[PDB]
């Protein structure tokens, strides 16, 4: 771990757009990991922080970063119901065939969750 990494994880998660930009410009570890393997992109994607999601992807964030359960930002966004974020992740090459260690792809979580709009985008993107 790193100090700026921990601040960036926290800023990305709670949606502090400005603090995110400050931390990035200061060389904050864009692929920092919390105790579950979550990167800033996982947390922003999960918590529906679209502006922070775009910033992170433009500043070197791994779009297909895999947490300790093999979940990618696309898994979390698709499960959470954040359609706009799902689309942005797909544009930046998010892997729709990414299986977590329970064998779920993002579509599986969207479909199970009843996020029909996202399920459809992921199937069509297969």
């Amino acid at each position: 771990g790193s100090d700026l990494g921990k601040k960036l994880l926290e800023a990305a998660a709670v949606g502090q757009d400005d603090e995110v930009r400050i931390l990035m410009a200061n060389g904050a570890d864009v692929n920092a990991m919390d105790q579950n393997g979550e990167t800033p992109l996982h947390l922003a994607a999960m918590n529906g922080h679209l502006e922070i999601v775009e910033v992170l992807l433009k500043t070197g964030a791994d779009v297909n970063a895999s947490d300790f359960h093999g979940d990618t930002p696309l898994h979390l966004a698709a499960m959470a119901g954040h359609l706009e974020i799902v689309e942005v992740l797909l544009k930046h090459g998010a892997d729709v065939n990414a299986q977590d260690t329970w064998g779920y792809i993002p579509f599986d979580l969207a479909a199970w969750a009843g996020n029909e709009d996202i399920a459809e985008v992921l199937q069509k993107a297969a």
Partner: protein
């Protein structure tokens, strides 16, 4: 990780409580990021 014992009167009460107990204990196997993603989805619906 501490273990508690409940006593239940009536088969139908046992069945209901065993179902809920199982759901609460099995839910603990679900990685927190999937739990938090689910809770984001709940927040969106309500």
């Amino acid at each position: 990780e501490d273990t508690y014992y409940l006593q239940v009167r009536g088969r139908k009460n046992f069945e209901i409580l065993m179902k809920l107990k199982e759901s609460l204990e099995l839910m603990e196997l679900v990685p927190q990021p999937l739990v938090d993603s689910y809770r984001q989805q709940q927040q969106l619906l309500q």
